[PDB]
Ligand binder design. Structure first.
Ligand SMILES: Nc1nc2c(ncn2[C@@H]2O[C@H](COP(=O)(O)OP(=O)(O)NP(=O)(O)O)[C@@H](O)[C@H]2O)c(=O)[nH]1
Ligand SMILES: [Ca+2]
Ligand SMILES: [Mg+2]
Length: 159
């Protein structure tokens, strides 16, 4: 079966682990729940293709990073700095992959919140400038979580 190596990156506490554990185990990380594990493997069927997903939940990180085939770049919609950090995460990925054209989706997480400081349009516009999809997610409600990871798999297949 086909394999996909996915890497989840982003600033602290944006929800990298929550998104990954929600996709892998269908439960929501809260305050004091374990996010010590950094790697996850899951067999899933995606558009009729049985897929083996390796997911690296980032906190020898560079050797792991270089092997990623696609990247979820995550910020939280109530964390302006995490959104401003995205450009640096993308630049790092581009350098370690040695490519201007890496499968990537921009994820705006925590879209369940009743107040936000990062507007959807400005994330939409940044993603357009990168040529990549933008998906708003909630690891809490599961909204868009499968959409984000599967869209990333589809971007890797398009590559
Ligand atoms: N309301 C809400 N809170 C969320 C959501 N996703 C994560 N959180 C909360 O945000 C905090 C950090 O989540 P976590 O997944 O650990 O983030 P992280 O990016 O893995 N942090 P770290 O860099 O420490 O690995 C936790 O309190 C978690 O419950 C979400 O979609 N909605
Ligand atoms: Ca293999
Ligand atoms: Mg984490």
């Amino acid at each position: 079966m086909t394999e996909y190596k996915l890497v989840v990156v982003g600033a602290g506490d944006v929800g990298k682990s929550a998104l990954t554990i929600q996709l892998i185990q269908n439960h929501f990380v809260d305050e004091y729940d374990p996010t010590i594990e950094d790697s996850y493997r899951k067999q899933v069927v995606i558009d009729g293709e049985t897929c083996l997903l390796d997911i690296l939940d980032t906190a020898m990180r560079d050797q792991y990073m270089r092997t990623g085939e696609g990247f979820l770049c995550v910020f939280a919609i109530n964390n302006t700095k995490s959104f401003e950090d995205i450009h640096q995460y993308r630049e790092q990925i581009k350098r370690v992959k040695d490519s201007d054209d890496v499968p990537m989706v921009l994820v705006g997480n925590k879209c369940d919140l009743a107040a936000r400081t990062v507007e959807s349009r400005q994330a939409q516009d940044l993603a357009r400038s990168y040529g990549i999809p933008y998906i708003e997610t909630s690891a809490k409600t599961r909204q868009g979580v499968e959409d984000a990871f599967y869209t990333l798999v589809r971007e890797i297949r398009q590559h």
